[PDB]
Amino acid sequence: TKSFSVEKGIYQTSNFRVSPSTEVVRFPNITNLCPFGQVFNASTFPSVYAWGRMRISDCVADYSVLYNSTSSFSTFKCYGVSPTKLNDLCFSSVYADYFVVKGDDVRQIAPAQTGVIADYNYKLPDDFTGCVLAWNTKSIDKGQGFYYRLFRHGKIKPYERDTSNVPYNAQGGTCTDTSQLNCYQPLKSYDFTDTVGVGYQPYRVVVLSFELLNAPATVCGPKQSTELVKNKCVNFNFNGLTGTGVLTESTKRFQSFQQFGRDISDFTDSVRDPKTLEILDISPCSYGGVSVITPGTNASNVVAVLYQDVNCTDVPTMLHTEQVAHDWRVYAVNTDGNMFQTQAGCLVGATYENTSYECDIPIGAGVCAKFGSTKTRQQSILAYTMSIG
Amino acid sequence: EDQSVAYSNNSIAIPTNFSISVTTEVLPVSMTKTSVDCNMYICGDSTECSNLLLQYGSFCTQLNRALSGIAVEQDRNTRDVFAQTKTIYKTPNIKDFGGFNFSQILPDPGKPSQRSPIEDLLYNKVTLRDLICAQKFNGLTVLPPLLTDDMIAAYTAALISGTATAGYTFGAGPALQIPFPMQMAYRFNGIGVTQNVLYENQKQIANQFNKAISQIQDSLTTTPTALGKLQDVINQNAAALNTLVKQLSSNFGAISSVLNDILSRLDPPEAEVQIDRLITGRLQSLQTYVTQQLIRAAEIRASANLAATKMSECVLGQSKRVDFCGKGYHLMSFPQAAPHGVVFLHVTYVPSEQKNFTTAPAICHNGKAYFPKEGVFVMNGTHWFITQRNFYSPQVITTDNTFESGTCDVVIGIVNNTV
Amino acid sequence: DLICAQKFNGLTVLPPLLTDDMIAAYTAALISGTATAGYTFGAGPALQIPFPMQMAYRFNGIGVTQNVLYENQKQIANQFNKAISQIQDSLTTTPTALGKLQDVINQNAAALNTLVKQLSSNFGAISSVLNDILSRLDPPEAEVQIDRLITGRLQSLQTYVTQQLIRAAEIRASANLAATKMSECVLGQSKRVD
Amino acid sequence: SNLLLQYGSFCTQLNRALSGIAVEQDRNTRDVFAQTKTIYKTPNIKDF
Numbered sequence A: 001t002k003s004f005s006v007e008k009g010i011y012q013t014s015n016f017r018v019s020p021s022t023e024v025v026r027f028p029n030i031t032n033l034c035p036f037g038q039v040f041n042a043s044t045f046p047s048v049y050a051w052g053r054m055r056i057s058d059c060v061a062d063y064s065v066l067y068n069s070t071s072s073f074s075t076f077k078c079y080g081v082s083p084t085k086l087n088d089l090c091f092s093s094v095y096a097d098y099f100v101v102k103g104d105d106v107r108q109i110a111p112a113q114t115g116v117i118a119d120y121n122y123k124l125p126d127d128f129t130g131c132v133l134a135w136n137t138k139s140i141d142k143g144q145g146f147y148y149r150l151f152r153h154g155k156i157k158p159y160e161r162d163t164s165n166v167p168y169n170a171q172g173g174t175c176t177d178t179s180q181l182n183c184y185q186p187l188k189s190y191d192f193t194d195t196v197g198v199g200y201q202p203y204r205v206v207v208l209s210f211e212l213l214n215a216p217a218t219v220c221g222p223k224q225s226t227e228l229v230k231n232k233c234v235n236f237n238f239n240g241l242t243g244t245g246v247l248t249e250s251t252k253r254f255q256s257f258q259q260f261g262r263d264i265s266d267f268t269d270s271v272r273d274p275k276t277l278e279i280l281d282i283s284p285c286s287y288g289g290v291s292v293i294t295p296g297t298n299a300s301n302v303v304a305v306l307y308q309d310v311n312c313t314d315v316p317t318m319l320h321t322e323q324v325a326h327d328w329r330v331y332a333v334n335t336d337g338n339m340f341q342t343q344a345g346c347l348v349g350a351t352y353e354n355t356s357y358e359c360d361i362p363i364g365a366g367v368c369a370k371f372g373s374t375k376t377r378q379q380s381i382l383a384y385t386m387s388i389g
Numbered sequence B: 001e002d003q004s005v006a007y008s009n010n011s012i013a014i015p016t017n018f019s020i021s022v023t024t025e026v027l028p029v030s031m032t033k034t035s036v037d038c039n040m041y042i043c044g045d046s047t048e049c050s051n052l053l054l055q056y057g058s059f060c061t062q063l064n065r066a067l068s069g070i071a072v073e074q075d076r077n078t079r080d081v082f083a084q085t086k087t088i089y090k091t092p093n094i095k096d097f098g099g100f101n102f103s104q105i106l107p108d109p110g111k112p113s114q115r116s117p118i119e120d121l122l123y124n125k126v127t128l129r130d131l132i133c134a135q136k137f138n139g140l141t142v143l144p145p146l147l148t149d150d151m152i153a154a155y156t157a158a159l160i161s162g163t164a165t166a167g168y169t170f171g172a173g174p175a176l177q178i179p180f181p182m183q184m185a186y187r188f189n190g191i192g193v194t195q196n197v198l199y200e201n202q203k204q205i206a207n208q209f210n211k212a213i214s215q216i217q218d219s220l221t222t223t224p225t226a227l228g229k230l231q232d233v234i235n236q237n238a239a240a241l242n243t244l245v246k247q248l249s250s251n252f253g254a255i256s257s258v259l260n261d262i263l264s265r266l267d268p269p270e271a272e273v274q275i276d277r278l279i280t281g282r283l284q285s286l287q288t289y290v291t292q293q294l295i296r297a298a299e300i301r302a303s304a305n306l307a308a309t310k311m312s313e314c315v316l317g318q319s320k321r322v323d324f325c326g327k328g329y330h331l332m333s334f335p336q337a338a339p340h341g342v343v344f345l346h347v348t349y350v351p352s353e354q355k356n357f358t359t360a361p362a363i364c365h366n367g368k369a370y371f372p373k374e375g376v377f378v379m380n381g382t383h384w385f386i387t388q389r390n391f392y393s394p395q396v397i398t399t400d401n402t403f404e405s406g407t408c409d410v411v412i413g414i415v416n417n418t419v
Numbered sequence C: 001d002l003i004c005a006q007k008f009n010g011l012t013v014l015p016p017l018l019t020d021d022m023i024a025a026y027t028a029a030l031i032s033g034t035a036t037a038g039y040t041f042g043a044g045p046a047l048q049i050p051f052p053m054q055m056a057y058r059f060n061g062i063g064v065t066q067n068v069l070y071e072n073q074k075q076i077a078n079q080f081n082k083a084i085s086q087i088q089d090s091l092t093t094t095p096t097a098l099g100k101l102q103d104v105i106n107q108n109a110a111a112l113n114t115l116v117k118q119l120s121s122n123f124g125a126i127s128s129v130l131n132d133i134l135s136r137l138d139p140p141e142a143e144v145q146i147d148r149l150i151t152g153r154l155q156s157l158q159t160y161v162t163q164q165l166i167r168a169a170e171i172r173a174s175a176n177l178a179a180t181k182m183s184e185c186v187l188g189q190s191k192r193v194d
Numbered sequence D: 001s002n003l004l005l006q007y008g009s010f011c012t013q014l015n016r017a018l019s020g021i022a023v024e025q026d027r028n029t030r031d032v033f034a035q036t037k038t039i040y041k042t043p044n045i046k047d048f
């Protein structure tokens, strides 16, 4: 309550008490570097109408290696992910497509485009996850041996390839011999002359398609392990997934290949934690309920703390004493005649009384509290059982 | 069904026997007390979401204030319904009062449960990885009621003992002692039936009362759908909370329903655009839940006010209102506790086995017309008698029970007779 | 029109279970029972008794001796008949008597039409027609243009349902009062003031 | 419709609320009017 004066009563408070300290970054154990060669530092790329595809697996991929001695990149655009977070993720599957175009056509390799390089040669789905890379290769690409389809009746579908070379009619189907004015050849060659204007120069385009699912990862990035720290509110960074919580041994079952388990509300509470493959359990850093009983700021400054649905045996486990300040350890795990167990919960900071009175500050389950002195002539909080008459 | 009867200008029907009937009424009183932690439900354990939610004002203070007000109002409802006495009267060990046997509505000392058998029956026939483990992980908690079941049972036992030993006099001052048959005679006298009927048929009435109470217990055992009005109150609550949890599985047009997935792949320019949809959707769900709870609490407040009025007017007195404390002329009522509600057992009087006679609105004597002070005049074929409406008990004609007003010229329906 | 638009947009009015003839039969049964037997059937088996006897008892209920009816029966009958005729004439002449029910009709209908009108708003989108958005834009901007309309329409429907619930609570209270008054004034004689 | 399927169970809640109101109206009419299980015949004469 955003104030400096509080009236007497019981209030329910937020946590503001415990915060994580440690980080655990368990990641798989693989050391093979991904073959960025023969993809970037290759010798031949196919035509756009007959484009290649390849699959990369069981490898570690850091992009910093591309910094040393590799040519810069004129176009580097990502759609489903941000470039600043590609070094902290693991992907279930990755595919690489690669082809060659002319410069003015580089703009066409993107979702929702029109033109000859998007309806008759190569189309991307609307919901594309992955990145597009494009760079100039004028010096190495020459000659007249790069083709793109110019004539077609319909339009292609996403991730589909056409490799046919059949004559194209202009009023219908079928044309056997070529010569008749109404018959054309459906392919055309990209003239790549040494002295040609910019925009008519060759470019190499590589498309990376990602897929993140509940499956074993294969193309993880560079991180380092930190070993497990149980029974302490911590920061955990298992493969891809991030969050905070307490990790504990668990005995659940996973359907063989499976990474994590959730509930009806989509809350992760189990991790396969590779290199041991032993299923753990995740719990929130604090849960349940804590309430504060006070007699008024202008009257005194001594307060009592009620933990609901907690039995006075695992309070040091429910409340992390080893991670709170010294002013909170006078509560929790200690007993100077202050721990008390009611049906509503555990009360810390007050002493029990046998005589019955009316109710001033209702605690619950027939238990009330009030402010008064005792035989030692000190102000304190007295808890008792409500009197019905 | 049709029961076509035309008319009759000179006939009166008077009943000549009666039955003691016990009816059951069920009334909800309170509902579950629920608390919500905004930060945990909307954001969970992410600091970025908390910082963004700090910019939305004081919506959560309003939500928590509304919920806390409802929670306090529930305890206030229970206290206003049940705590209508200042002192607790001890349960008399001898539970037979002049025949009438309270064996079934007062707690038996030999049973450690310290409750009534009918109360035990009612508490048995109301029934509610895990589900409560998902509510707690997301900030939804249920708070225990202030008054325990034992204190409510004590209140009920004190009320029953007081009305058994001291009548209804303990609702208007200090309790005054009176035997139970005298109280029953007073209650009979309340509804226009002379108190001689109870004394002359004391054994029959006592046996009818005991048999009626036993049959009510049996009918409670047999029919399962009698208490549904209370059961729905539980269900409509639980089905709400669970629904809220399922709403965390929606994405509201974003890329995912998991905040960590959004924060592990996207840069802030699109991260905020994705986050705001989730935050707005969750705020909308929480607000809808709170509004529905407020409306339901208003309805239960109306029900609690009705129950308090019924306890004040039927348990602490005899009411003349028609069809308020039961079907029939009211004799008394008894309260019993039940999960989130009260059950009233109404003991009432039902006429039966009627008979039909000839009537006349007045009698002439010496030219002066005598009219009934309180009764009605009937003919048994030979003699003219005066009889009360609710029971057949004729009395011979005399100047005491009839009054004279005017002559017998404009009088219609008068008959010639002597005194 | 104004009803084809309601049916073309998913809004339906359902008929009540009890027909008008059934309610008229219930009312006629109540009147006949209270005219030939008194208020006896409200406490148990119906016992027949002439109307003058019942209404003399009803004098006896208000601390006035029943002889007043005995000496002034014809005048009472004529006064009752003329009161009934005057009530009928006042119903014929005065047009503002039934307004309390009239609102219940009108203020209901005004809600539904309002909802229909809300389909013409765009809530900050390019247009209020989904087909225009779907036939001119691509999903990257189509999603942003459609979510606004979806949110606005969902909010409108939620607001309508909330006021419906509040109105239902109010009419429930009124119906409970009517049921109590039918139990007490029609099936018996009340001592409560006004 | 495919995009609206992602909005949870709002339509179900709205339908349940409206159905509850609909049943409550019939309960109101039944409570106000249906109080006797016998329907007495209208007497021939209407002059008592």
Ligand SMILES: *[C@@H]1O[C@H](CO)[C@@H](O[C@@H]2O[C@H](CO)[C@@H](O[C@@H]3O[C@H](CO)[C@@H](O)[C@H](O[C@H]4O[C@H](CO)[C@@H](O)[C@H](O)[C@@H]4O)[C@@H]3O)[C@H](O)[C@H]2NC(C)=O)[C@H](O)[C@H]1NC(C)=O
Pocket: A152, A153, A154, A155, A156, A157, A160, A169, A170, A171, A172, A173
């Ligand atoms: C997968 O392969 C199938 C073929 O195996 C392919 O179906 C073909 O689609 C095209 C249309 O895109 C068809 O071509 C049309 O055929 C009709 C009937 O002969 C003609 O009338 C059409 O001519 C009209 O339209 C032309 C412009 O498109 C005009 O120039 C012309 O004057 C006419 O107005 C046109 O030729 C073709 O017939 C079928 N398949 C066959 C061989 O029958 C399908 O499209 C492919 N799917 C993919 C991945 O795109």
Ligand SMILES: *[C@@H]1O[C@H](CO)[C@@H](O[C@@H]2O[C@H](CO)[C@@H](O)[C@H](O)[C@H]2NC(C)=O)[C@H](O)[C@H]1NC(C)=O
Pocket: A065, A068, A069
């Ligand atoms: C940086 O680039 C230089 C380019 O010469 C690399 O030099 C050689 O790289 C090959 C392959 O990694 C090694 O086998 C040689 O031993 C390197 N020789 C030199 C000059 O060191 C160099 O390794 C690159 N370093 C990286 C990748 O960080």
Ligand SMILES: *[C@@H]1O[C@H](CO)[C@@H](O[C@@H]2O[C@H](CO)[C@@H](O)[C@H](O)[C@H]2NC(C)=O)[C@H](O)[C@H]1NC(C)=O
Pocket: A180, A181, A182, A183
């Ligand atoms: C395609 O472009 C050519 C050149 O602009 C157009 O000219 C045709 O060229 C072909 C090949 O020499 C001939 O067979 C045609 O007879 C030419 N047609 C005419 C009338 O010029 C050709 O028309 C264009 N085709 C289209 C637009 O489909």
Ligand SMILES: *[C@@H]1O[C@H](CO)[C@@H](O[C@@H]2O[C@H](CO)[C@@H](O)[C@H](O)[C@H]2NC(C)=O)[C@H](O)[C@H]1NC(C)=O
Pocket: A029, A274, A275, A276, A277
């Ligand atoms: C790589 O991970 C695997 C498990 O997926 C490790 O396997 C065991 O790891 C424990 C670690 O204490 C060793 O004691 C066992 O001897 C390992 N068994 C096998 C069959 O490997 C493996 O040790 C890990 N290797 C690294 C790099 O630590």
Ligand SMILES: *[C@@H]1O[C@H](CO)[C@@H](O[C@@H]2O[C@H](CO)[C@@H](O)[C@H](O)[C@H]2NC(C)=O)[C@H](O)[C@H]1NC(C)=O
Pocket: B016, B017, B018, B204
């Ligand atoms: C009214 O009905 C009751 C029965 O419901 C009568 O009580 C019975 O009285 C007879 C003797 O006359 C006993 O043999 C029966 O055992 C009694 N009832 C039962 C079934 O136990 C009562 O006498 C009747 N009173 C009048 C005036 O008719």
Ligand SMILES: *[C@@H]1O[C@H](CO)[C@@H](O[C@@H]2O[C@H](CO)[C@@H](O)[C@H](O)[C@H]2NC(C)=O)[C@H](O)[C@H]1NC(C)=O
Pocket: C081, C082, C085, D046, D047
């Ligand atoms: C009162 O009742 C009498 C019948 O006893 C009515 O007398 C006739 O009623 C009919 C309508 O039902 C009229 O058309 C006749 O003109 C009346 N006169 C006759 C022929 O008796 C009388 O109308 C009723 N009046 C009231 C107060 O409604």
Ligand SMILES: *[C@@H]1O[C@H](CO)[C@@H](O)[C@H](O)[C@H]1NC(C)=O
Pocket: A040, A041, A042, A069, A070, A071
């Ligand atoms: C490929 O690698 C070789 C050896 O480092 C280098 O000489 C050549 O220029 C590279 N070609 C590229 C970068 O395409």
Ligand SMILES: *[C@@H]1O[C@H](CO)[C@@H](O)[C@H](O)[C@H]1NC(C)=O
Pocket: A310, A311
């Ligand atoms: C807490 O203690 C009570 C009394 O011993 C016991 O009935 C209950 O099961 C305990 N609950 C926990 C948290 O173990």
Ligand SMILES: *[C@@H]1O[C@H](CO)[C@@H](O)[C@H](O)[C@H]1NC(C)=O
Pocket: B009, B010, B413
């Ligand atoms: C009863 O009806 C008969 C026949 O109409 C009539 O002669 C007699 O006067 C009526 N008496 C009463 C009680 O109204």
Ligand SMILES: *[C@@H]1O[C@H](CO)[C@@H](O)[C@H](O)[C@H]1NC(C)=O
Pocket: B095, B096, B099, B100, B101, B102, B103, B104
């Ligand atoms: C009350 O009822 C119980 C159960 O039938 C019976 O055992 C007890 O004797 C009764 N009390 C008396 C004496 O009426």
Ligand SMILES: *[C@@H]1O[C@H](CO)[C@@H](O)[C@H](O)[C@H]1NC(C)=O
Pocket: B011, B356, B357, B358
């Ligand atoms: C009473 O009702 C019975 C059955 O209809 C009839 O036979 C008898 O004559 C009636 N007697 C009187 C006084 O109404």
Ligand SMILES: *[C@@H]1O[C@H](CO)[C@@H](O)[C@H](O)[C@H]1NC(C)=O
Pocket: B380, B381, B382, B383
């Ligand atoms: C009343 O009628 C009964 C027969 O039903 C008769 O036995 C009795 O004597 C009559 N009343 C008198 C005159 O006592």
